[PDB]
Amino acid sequence: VSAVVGMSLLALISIFASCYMLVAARSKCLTPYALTPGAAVPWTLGILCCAP
Amino acid sequence: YEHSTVMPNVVGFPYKAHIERPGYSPLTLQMQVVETSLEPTLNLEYITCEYKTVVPSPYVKCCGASECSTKEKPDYQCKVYTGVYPFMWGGAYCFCDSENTQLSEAYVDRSDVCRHDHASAYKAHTASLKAKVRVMYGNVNQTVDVYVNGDHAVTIGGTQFIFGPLSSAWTPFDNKIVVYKDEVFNQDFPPYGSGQPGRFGDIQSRTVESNDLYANTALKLARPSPGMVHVPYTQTPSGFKYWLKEKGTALNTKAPFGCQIKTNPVRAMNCAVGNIPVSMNLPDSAFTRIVEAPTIIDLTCTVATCTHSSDFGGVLTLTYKTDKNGDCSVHSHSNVATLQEATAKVKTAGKVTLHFSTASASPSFVVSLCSARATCSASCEPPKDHIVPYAASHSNVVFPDMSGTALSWVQKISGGLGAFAIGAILVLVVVTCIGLRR
Ligand SMILES: *[C@@H]1O[C@H](CO)[C@@H](O[C@@H]2O[C@H](CO)[C@@H](O)[C@H](O)[C@H]2NC(C)=O)[C@H](O)[C@H]1NC(C)=O
Ligand SMILES: *[C@@H]1O[C@H](CO)[C@@H](O)[C@H](O)[C@H]1NC(C)=O
């Protein structure tokens, strides 16, 4: 029981950390385009990441 | 040639010892422990038995008075009573109606059975171990009696053996024990000269034949009833019978580690604890040179059936290619699986059958037929019987090999998660390097 609980917890924290850091990478790649007045994100980068 | 190894101190468990020196074929030793004894050194403190009270005939004096003097006897109690008028079957005993006196005395002495029924009080000290081990190799099969203390050195077919000392100093006996007939007890006892009436040790003697005695039984006299000749006395019953009634539970039915306790002398047998080290010095006549030993090449191993049970639930087959007929030595190099045979006959056909026992779901071990080695991996299913009458013939290991099914699944899951994490790390590092370049 203890081993299963520990393994599940470790898998969950690994998945969460990976997802959060990938989200951070997205948000840091697409952060300057929201600050530039006018202009627009390229369609390719706006497809490989969801760009509002 | 010197060698060293350790064995588990469990009775009946076969143990294979592998030796290997340059320029000779390997040799396999088998040593088994038949029985063990643990004996503590005892110093007697005192003994106890049922007591008896000696009441002599009272002294009655007509028309006079008597006084009585003390004597050096155990619990000597004497009193003089005045104004007594004894009666007998004929009539009165003395003329004087109220000028008489009576002297009554009594004391306590040990029973006439103390030589046959007594309980001893001891004090246990550091204990020694004796063993009876059987050795077997080549064409030698003998059993010897050895002292497991690192001092004894016995020779068996030209080979010196030195056993011990044991890895753990554990003794079931407490500091103070009491021995009676066939049982022993871990109970404290009152110190000599301070016994208490009605309990254990109310009558103490330094030894069986000693002439001194300590008795404290609360012997009180009483005045005789009028018109009668008798000595009355009230005395607390024997403490030895009281102890014999609800002494408690014996160590024989309480000793841990499955230890059989016998007396005369006080000793504990077949205690399963710790592991003994063995040092040996084998001569050059017991080996065989590499030239006159068969050469084995291309050795592979396979397992037919496997059921991890206390018996020898496993059959494995080795295939090989040899050059002459002869006999080799086999051995398993891991404690996961223990073989049954030590020497096997090889021939030109190239197939042998071996029996092994294990306690793991998926065992992995390396066997060795003469100078060649191979690896074995198997999958075993649990047995169905719940209770068995014989002891386990396998070392208790349950951790499966890293290539087993469960560890295989955990490896795949871990690999997938690690790949995802590594990809995320690489993506972040590339994006941040591009961002910093700006
Ligand atoms: C015989 O009996 C007489 C009493 O009948 C005893 O005399 C008594 O002696 C004691 C001891 O000196 C005195 O205290 C009493 O006063 C005596 N009694 C009387 C009535 O005088 C005598 O001692 C007895 N003799 C023998 C040999 O038994
Ligand atoms: C060794 O000797 C004992 C006593 O005769 C015997 O019981 C046992 O089977 C022998 N072992 C072998 C392998 O011959």
Side-chain angles (χ1 to χ4, degrees), chain B residues 95-123:
Chain B
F95 251 68
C96 287
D97 258 9
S98 93
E99 326 327 334
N100 291 278
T101 206
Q102 167 179 43
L103 179 166
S104 43
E105 90 272 30
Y107 59 91
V108 52
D109 168 324
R110 82 153 60 90
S111 100
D112 43 358
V113 152
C114 211
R115 194 181 41 280
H116 298 270
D117 172 342
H118 57 270
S120 307
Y122 282 118
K123 185 173 318 281

PDB file of all heavy atoms in Angstrom, chain B residues 95-123:
ATOM      1  N   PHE B  95      -1.011 -33.359  92.986  1.00  0.00           N
ATOM      2  CA  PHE B  95      -1.810 -32.857  94.104  1.00  0.00           C
ATOM      3  C   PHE B  95      -2.077 -31.363  93.996  1.00  0.00           C
ATOM      4  O   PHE B  95      -3.229 -30.926  94.099  1.00  0.00           O
ATOM      5  CB  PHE B  95      -1.121 -33.164  95.436  1.00  0.00           C
ATOM      6  CG  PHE B  95      -1.809 -34.222  96.247  1.00  0.00           C
ATOM      7  CD1 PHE B  95      -1.850 -35.537  95.831  1.00  0.00           C
ATOM      8  CD2 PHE B  95      -2.416 -33.884  97.444  1.00  0.00           C
ATOM      9  CE1 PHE B  95      -2.498 -36.489  96.600  1.00  0.00           C
ATOM     10  CE2 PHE B  95      -3.055 -34.829  98.211  1.00  0.00           C
ATOM     11  CZ  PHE B  95      -3.098 -36.132  97.791  1.00  0.00           C
ATOM     12  N   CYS B  96      -1.025 -30.561  93.815  1.00  0.00           N
ATOM     13  CA  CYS B  96      -1.158 -29.108  93.875  1.00  0.00           C
ATOM     14  C   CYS B  96      -2.208 -28.603  92.894  1.00  0.00           C
ATOM     15  O   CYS B  96      -2.069 -28.759  91.677  1.00  0.00           O
ATOM     16  CB  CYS B  96       0.196 -28.428  93.632  1.00  0.00           C
ATOM     17  SG  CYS B  96       1.369 -28.563  95.021  1.00  0.00           S
ATOM     18  N   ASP B  97      -3.274 -28.007  93.437  1.00  0.00           N
ATOM     19  CA  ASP B  97      -4.403 -27.583  92.617  1.00  0.00           C
ATOM     20  C   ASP B  97      -4.004 -26.497  91.627  1.00  0.00           C
ATOM     21  O   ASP B  97      -4.412 -26.535  90.461  1.00  0.00           O
ATOM     22  CB  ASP B  97      -5.540 -27.091  93.512  1.00  0.00           C
ATOM     23  CG  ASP B  97      -6.645 -28.114  93.669  1.00  0.00           C
ATOM     24  OD1 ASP B  97      -6.461 -29.267  93.223  1.00  0.00           O
ATOM     25  OD2 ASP B  97      -7.700 -27.763  94.239  1.00  0.00           O
ATOM     26  N   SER B  98      -3.215 -25.517  92.070  1.00  0.00           N
ATOM     27  CA  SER B  98      -2.850 -24.393  91.216  1.00  0.00           C
ATOM     28  C   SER B  98      -1.391 -23.989  91.381  1.00  0.00           C
ATOM     29  O   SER B  98      -1.018 -22.874  91.002  1.00  0.00           O
ATOM     30  CB  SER B  98      -3.762 -23.195  91.489  1.00  0.00           C
ATOM     31  OG  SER B  98      -3.195 -22.330  92.457  1.00  0.00           O
ATOM     32  N   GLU B  99      -0.554 -24.865  91.938  1.00  0.00           N
ATOM     33  CA  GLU B  99       0.866 -24.590  92.109  1.00  0.00           C
ATOM     34  C   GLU B  99       1.724 -25.368  91.116  1.00  0.00           C
ATOM     35  O   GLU B  99       2.889 -25.661  91.403  1.00  0.00           O
ATOM     36  CB  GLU B  99       1.309 -24.900  93.544  1.00  0.00           C
ATOM     37  CG  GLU B  99       0.303 -24.656  94.702  1.00  0.00           C
ATOM     38  CD  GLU B  99      -0.673 -23.488  94.521  1.00  0.00           C
ATOM     39  OE1 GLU B  99      -0.365 -22.515  93.798  1.00  0.00           O
ATOM     40  OE2 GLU B  99      -1.770 -23.551  95.115  1.00  0.00           O
ATOM     41  N   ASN B 100       1.170 -25.707  89.956  1.00  0.00           N
ATOM     42  CA  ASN B 100       1.877 -26.487  88.955  1.00  0.00           C
ATOM     43  C   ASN B 100       2.468 -25.566  87.889  1.00  0.00           C
ATOM     44  O   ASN B 100       2.302 -24.344  87.921  1.00  0.00           O
ATOM     45  CB  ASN B 100       0.933 -27.508  88.325  1.00  0.00           C
ATOM     46  CG  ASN B 100       0.543 -28.609  89.285  1.00  0.00           C
ATOM     47  OD1 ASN B 100       1.282 -29.571  89.478  1.00  0.00           O
ATOM     48  ND2 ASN B 100      -0.625 -28.471  89.898  1.00  0.00           N
ATOM     49  N   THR B 101       3.167 -26.164  86.924  1.00  0.00           N
ATOM     50  CA  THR B 101       3.707 -25.424  85.791  1.00  0.00           C
ATOM     51  C   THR B 101       3.964 -26.400  84.653  1.00  0.00           C
ATOM     52  O   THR B 101       4.083 -27.607  84.888  1.00  0.00           O
ATOM     53  CB  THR B 101       4.996 -24.680  86.168  1.00  0.00           C
ATOM     54  OG1 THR B 101       5.159 -23.542  85.315  1.00  0.00           O
ATOM     55  CG2 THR B 101       6.212 -25.589  86.029  1.00  0.00           C
ATOM     56  N   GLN B 102       4.027 -25.883  83.430  1.00  0.00           N
ATOM     57  CA  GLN B 102       4.299 -26.687  82.247  1.00  0.00           C
ATOM     58  C   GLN B 102       5.287 -25.957  81.348  1.00  0.00           C
ATOM     59  O   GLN B 102       5.201 -24.735  81.188  1.00  0.00           O
ATOM     60  CB  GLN B 102       3.011 -26.994  81.479  1.00  0.00           C
ATOM     61  CG  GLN B 102       3.240 -27.550  80.084  1.00  0.00           C
ATOM     62  CD  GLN B 102       1.950 -27.855  79.359  1.00  0.00           C
ATOM     63  OE1 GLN B 102       1.002 -27.077  79.407  1.00  0.00           O
ATOM     64  NE2 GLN B 102       1.906 -28.991  78.676  1.00  0.00           N
ATOM     65  N   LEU B 103       6.220 -26.706  80.767  1.00  0.00           N
ATOM     66  CA  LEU B 103       7.196 -26.172  79.828  1.00  0.00           C
ATOM     67  C   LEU B 103       6.954 -26.802  78.465  1.00  0.00           C
ATOM     68  O   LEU B 103       6.974 -28.031  78.332  1.00  0.00           O
ATOM     69  CB  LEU B 103       8.624 -26.445  80.319  1.00  0.00           C
ATOM     70  CG  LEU B 103       9.890 -26.042  79.552  1.00  0.00           C
ATOM     71  CD1 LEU B 103      11.083 -26.152  80.484  1.00  0.00           C
ATOM     72  CD2 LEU B 103      10.149 -26.890  78.311  1.00  0.00           C
ATOM     73  N   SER B 104       6.728 -25.963  77.458  1.00  0.00           N
ATOM     74  CA  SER B 104       6.505 -26.421  76.096  1.00  0.00           C
ATOM     75  C   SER B 104       7.462 -25.703  75.158  1.00  0.00           C
ATOM     76  O   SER B 104       7.671 -24.492  75.266  1.00  0.00           O
ATOM     77  CB  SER B 104       5.059 -26.183  75.649  1.00  0.00           C
ATOM     78  OG  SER B 104       4.605 -24.905  76.057  1.00  0.00           O
ATOM     79  N   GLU B 105       8.035 -26.463  74.228  1.00  0.00           N
ATOM     80  CA  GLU B 105       8.992 -25.902  73.286  1.00  0.00           C
ATOM     81  C   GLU B 105       8.876 -26.642  71.964  1.00  0.00           C
ATOM     82  O   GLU B 105       8.414 -27.784  71.908  1.00  0.00           O
ATOM     83  CB  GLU B 105      10.422 -25.974  73.832  1.00  0.00           C
ATOM     84  CG  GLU B 105      11.171 -27.250  73.484  1.00  0.00           C
ATOM     85  CD  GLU B 105      10.942 -28.357  74.493  1.00  0.00           C
ATOM     86  OE1 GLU B 105       9.857 -28.394  75.109  1.00  0.00           O
ATOM     87  OE2 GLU B 105      11.854 -29.192  74.675  1.00  0.00           O
ATOM     88  N   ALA B 106       9.296 -25.967  70.896  1.00  0.00           N
ATOM     89  CA  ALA B 106       9.249 -26.531  69.556  1.00  0.00           C
ATOM     90  C   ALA B 106      10.241 -25.782  68.680  1.00  0.00           C
ATOM     91  O   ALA B 106      10.640 -24.655  68.988  1.00  0.00           O
ATOM     92  CB  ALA B 106       7.839 -26.456  68.964  1.00  0.00           C
ATOM     93  N   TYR B 107      10.632 -26.421  67.582  1.00  0.00           N
ATOM     94  CA  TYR B 107      11.549 -25.819  66.621  1.00  0.00           C
ATOM     95  C   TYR B 107      11.304 -26.455  65.257  1.00  0.00           C
ATOM     96  O   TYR B 107      10.517 -27.397  65.122  1.00  0.00           O
ATOM     97  CB  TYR B 107      13.004 -25.958  67.090  1.00  0.00           C
ATOM     98  CG  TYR B 107      13.473 -27.382  67.292  1.00  0.00           C
ATOM     99  CD1 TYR B 107      14.084 -28.084  66.264  1.00  0.00           C
ATOM    100  CD2 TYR B 107      13.321 -28.016  68.517  1.00  0.00           C
ATOM    101  CE1 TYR B 107      14.519 -29.381  66.446  1.00  0.00           C
ATOM    102  CE2 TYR B 107      13.753 -29.313  68.708  1.00  0.00           C
ATOM    103  CZ  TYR B 107      14.351 -29.990  67.670  1.00  0.00           C
ATOM    104  OH  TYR B 107      14.784 -31.282  67.853  1.00  0.00           O
ATOM    105  N   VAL B 108      11.983 -25.931  64.238  1.00  0.00           N
ATOM    106  CA  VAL B 108      11.782 -26.338  62.853  1.00  0.00           C
ATOM    107  C   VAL B 108      13.097 -26.855  62.286  1.00  0.00           C
ATOM    108  O   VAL B 108      14.155 -26.249  62.490  1.00  0.00           O
ATOM    109  CB  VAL B 108      11.226 -25.174  62.002  1.00  0.00           C
ATOM    110  CG1 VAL B 108      12.074 -23.938  62.175  1.00  0.00           C
ATOM    111  CG2 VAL B 108      11.169 -25.562  60.539  1.00  0.00           C
ATOM    112  N   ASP B 109      13.034 -27.996  61.602  1.00  0.00           N
ATOM    113  CA  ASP B 109      14.203 -28.598  60.982  1.00  0.00           C
ATOM    114  C   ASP B 109      13.770 -29.104  59.612  1.00  0.00           C
ATOM    115  O   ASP B 109      12.589 -29.361  59.370  1.00  0.00           O
ATOM    116  CB  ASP B 109      14.789 -29.702  61.895  1.00  0.00           C
ATOM    117  CG  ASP B 109      15.833 -30.594  61.210  1.00  0.00           C
ATOM    118  OD1 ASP B 109      15.723 -30.919  60.014  1.00  0.00           O
ATOM    119  OD2 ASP B 109      16.804 -30.972  61.899  1.00  0.00           O
ATOM    120  N   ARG B 110      14.741 -29.237  58.711  1.00  0.00           N
ATOM    121  CA  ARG B 110      14.440 -29.587  57.329  1.00  0.00           C
ATOM    122  C   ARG B 110      13.898 -31.010  57.227  1.00  0.00           C
ATOM    123  O   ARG B 110      14.153 -31.862  58.081  1.00  0.00           O
ATOM    124  CB  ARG B 110      15.690 -29.426  56.466  1.00  0.00           C
ATOM    125  CG  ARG B 110      16.641 -30.603  56.524  1.00  0.00           C
ATOM    126  CD  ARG B 110      17.446 -30.718  55.246  1.00  0.00           C
ATOM    127  NE  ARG B 110      18.231 -29.514  55.009  1.00  0.00           N
ATOM    128  CZ  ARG B 110      19.469 -29.331  55.446  1.00  0.00           C
ATOM    129  NH1 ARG B 110      20.099 -30.261  56.146  1.00  0.00           N
ATOM    130  NH2 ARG B 110      20.088 -28.185  55.180  1.00  0.00           N
ATOM    131  N   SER B 111      13.128 -31.260  56.173  1.00  0.00           N
ATOM    132  CA  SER B 111      12.493 -32.559  56.010  1.00  0.00           C
ATOM    133  C   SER B 111      13.524 -33.631  55.680  1.00  0.00           C
ATOM    134  O   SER B 111      14.652 -33.346  55.264  1.00  0.00           O
ATOM    135  CB  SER B 111      11.430 -32.511  54.913  1.00  0.00           C
ATOM    136  OG  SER B 111      11.922 -33.044  53.697  1.00  0.00           O
ATOM    137  N   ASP B 112      13.119 -34.885  55.872  1.00  0.00           N
ATOM    138  CA  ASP B 112      13.953 -36.025  55.518  1.00  0.00           C
ATOM    139  C   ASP B 112      13.918 -36.342  54.030  1.00  0.00           C
ATOM    140  O   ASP B 112      14.334 -37.435  53.635  1.00  0.00           O
ATOM    141  CB  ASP B 112      13.522 -37.258  56.315  1.00  0.00           C
ATOM    142  CG  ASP B 112      12.016 -37.407  56.387  1.00  0.00           C
ATOM    143  OD1 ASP B 112      11.305 -36.529  55.855  1.00  0.00           O
ATOM    144  OD2 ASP B 112      11.542 -38.403  56.973  1.00  0.00           O
ATOM    145  N   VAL B 113      13.434 -35.420  53.204  1.00  0.00           N
ATOM    146  CA  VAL B 113      13.273 -35.643  51.777  1.00  0.00           C
ATOM    147  C   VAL B 113      14.034 -34.586  50.968  1.00  0.00           C
ATOM    148  O   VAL B 113      14.272 -34.767  49.772  1.00  0.00           O
ATOM    149  CB  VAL B 113      11.774 -35.713  51.417  1.00  0.00           C
ATOM    150  CG1 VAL B 113      11.470 -35.282  49.987  1.00  0.00           C
ATOM    151  CG2 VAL B 113      11.245 -37.118  51.672  1.00  0.00           C
ATOM    152  N   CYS B 114      14.503 -33.522  51.636  1.00  0.00           N
ATOM    153  CA  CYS B 114      15.280 -32.464  50.984  1.00  0.00           C
ATOM    154  C   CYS B 114      16.364 -32.997  50.060  1.00  0.00           C
ATOM    155  O   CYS B 114      16.704 -32.333  49.075  1.00  0.00           O
ATOM    156  CB  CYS B 114      15.927 -31.556  52.031  1.00  0.00           C
ATOM    157  SG  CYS B 114      16.131 -29.831  51.519  1.00  0.00           S
ATOM    158  N   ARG B 115      16.915 -34.172  50.354  1.00  0.00           N
ATOM    159  CA  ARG B 115      17.894 -34.799  49.479  1.00  0.00           C
ATOM    160  C   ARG B 115      17.292 -35.260  48.158  1.00  0.00           C
ATOM    161  O   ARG B 115      18.037 -35.459  47.194  1.00  0.00           O
ATOM    162  CB  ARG B 115      18.536 -35.984  50.202  1.00  0.00           C
ATOM    163  CG  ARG B 115      19.798 -36.532  49.559  1.00  0.00           C
ATOM    164  CD  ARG B 115      20.430 -37.745  50.282  1.00  0.00           C
ATOM    165  NE  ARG B 115      19.494 -38.745  50.792  1.00  0.00           N
ATOM    166  CZ  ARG B 115      18.804 -38.647  51.922  1.00  0.00           C
ATOM    167  NH1 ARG B 115      18.983 -37.637  52.758  1.00  0.00           N
ATOM    168  NH2 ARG B 115      17.930 -39.599  52.232  1.00  0.00           N
ATOM    169  N   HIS B 116      15.973 -35.417  48.086  1.00  0.00           N
ATOM    170  CA  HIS B 116      15.309 -35.921  46.893  1.00  0.00           C
ATOM    171  C   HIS B 116      14.392 -34.911  46.222  1.00  0.00           C
ATOM    172  O   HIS B 116      14.191 -34.997  45.009  1.00  0.00           O
ATOM    173  CB  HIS B 116      14.486 -37.173  47.234  1.00  0.00           C
ATOM    174  CG  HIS B 116      15.309 -38.320  47.732  1.00  0.00           C
ATOM    175  ND1 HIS B 116      15.848 -39.271  46.893  1.00  0.00           N
ATOM    176  CD2 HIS B 116      15.681 -38.670  48.985  1.00  0.00           C
ATOM    177  CE1 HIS B 116      16.520 -40.155  47.608  1.00  0.00           C
ATOM    178  NE2 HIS B 116      16.434 -39.814  48.881  1.00  0.00           N
ATOM    179  N   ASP B 117      13.828 -33.964  46.970  1.00  0.00           N
ATOM    180  CA  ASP B 117      12.871 -32.997  46.435  1.00  0.00           C
ATOM    181  C   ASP B 117      13.318 -31.625  46.927  1.00  0.00           C
ATOM    182  O   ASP B 117      13.001 -31.228  48.052  1.00  0.00           O
ATOM    183  CB  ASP B 117      11.447 -33.337  46.885  1.00  0.00           C
ATOM    184  CG  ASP B 117      10.412 -32.268  46.515  1.00  0.00           C
ATOM    185  OD1 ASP B 117      10.762 -31.110  46.207  1.00  0.00           O
ATOM    186  OD2 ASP B 117       9.210 -32.604  46.540  1.00  0.00           O
ATOM    187  N   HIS B 118      14.054 -30.903  46.087  1.00  0.00           N
ATOM    188  CA  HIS B 118      14.476 -29.554  46.425  1.00  0.00           C
ATOM    189  C   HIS B 118      14.565 -28.730  45.152  1.00  0.00           C
ATOM    190  O   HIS B 118      14.749 -29.271  44.059  1.00  0.00           O
ATOM    191  CB  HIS B 118      15.820 -29.547  47.159  1.00  0.00           C
ATOM    192  CG  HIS B 118      16.927 -30.203  46.397  1.00  0.00           C
ATOM    193  ND1 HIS B 118      17.219 -31.544  46.512  1.00  0.00           N
ATOM    194  CD2 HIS B 118      17.816 -29.700  45.506  1.00  0.00           C
ATOM    195  CE1 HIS B 118      18.240 -31.839  45.727  1.00  0.00           C
ATOM    196  NE2 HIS B 118      18.620 -30.738  45.106  1.00  0.00           N
ATOM    197  N   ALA B 119      14.430 -27.418  45.307  1.00  0.00           N
ATOM    198  CA  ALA B 119      14.535 -26.474  44.206  1.00  0.00           C
ATOM    199  C   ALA B 119      15.760 -25.600  44.421  1.00  0.00           C
ATOM    200  O   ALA B 119      15.971 -25.082  45.522  1.00  0.00           O
ATOM    201  CB  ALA B 119      13.276 -25.612  44.098  1.00  0.00           C
ATOM    202  N   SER B 120      16.562 -25.442  43.376  1.00  0.00           N
ATOM    203  CA  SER B 120      17.811 -24.707  43.479  1.00  0.00           C
ATOM    204  C   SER B 120      17.647 -23.274  42.983  1.00  0.00           C
ATOM    205  O   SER B 120      16.842 -22.983  42.097  1.00  0.00           O
ATOM    206  CB  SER B 120      18.910 -25.410  42.685  1.00  0.00           C
ATOM    207  OG  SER B 120      19.019 -26.770  43.061  1.00  0.00           O
ATOM    208  N   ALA B 121      18.430 -22.377  43.575  1.00  0.00           N
ATOM    209  CA  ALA B 121      18.503 -20.987  43.150  1.00  0.00           C
ATOM    210  C   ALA B 121      19.888 -20.735  42.577  1.00  0.00           C
ATOM    211  O   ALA B 121      20.894 -21.017  43.236  1.00  0.00           O
ATOM    212  CB  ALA B 121      18.222 -20.029  44.310  1.00  0.00           C
ATOM    213  N   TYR B 122      19.940 -20.205  41.359  1.00  0.00           N
ATOM    214  CA  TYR B 122      21.188 -20.043  40.629  1.00  0.00           C
ATOM    215  C   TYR B 122      21.350 -18.590  40.206  1.00  0.00           C
ATOM    216  O   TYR B 122      20.470 -17.752  40.421  1.00  0.00           O
ATOM    217  CB  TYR B 122      21.233 -20.967  39.407  1.00  0.00           C
ATOM    218  CG  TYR B 122      21.561 -22.404  39.727  1.00  0.00           C
ATOM    219  CD1 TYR B 122      20.655 -23.418  39.461  1.00  0.00           C
ATOM    220  CD2 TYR B 122      22.780 -22.748  40.292  1.00  0.00           C
ATOM    221  CE1 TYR B 122      20.950 -24.733  39.749  1.00  0.00           C
ATOM    222  CE2 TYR B 122      23.084 -24.061  40.582  1.00  0.00           C
ATOM    223  CZ  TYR B 122      22.165 -25.050  40.308  1.00  0.00           C
ATOM    224  OH  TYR B 122      22.463 -26.360  40.598  1.00  0.00           O
ATOM    225  N   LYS B 123      22.495 -18.296  39.594  1.00  0.00           N
ATOM    226  CA  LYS B 123      22.774 -16.968  39.059  1.00  0.00           C
ATOM    227  C   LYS B 123      23.533 -17.143  37.753  1.00  0.00           C
ATOM    228  O   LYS B 123      24.703 -17.535  37.765  1.00  0.00           O
ATOM    229  CB  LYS B 123      23.579 -16.130  40.053  1.00  0.00           C
ATOM    230  CG  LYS B 123      23.813 -14.695  39.614  1.00  0.00           C
ATOM    231  CD  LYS B 123      24.462 -13.874  40.722  1.00  0.00           C
ATOM    232  CE  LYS B 123      23.852 -14.185  42.079  1.00  0.00           C
ATOM    233  NZ  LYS B 123      22.546 -13.499  42.275  1.00  0.00           N
TER     234      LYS B 123
END
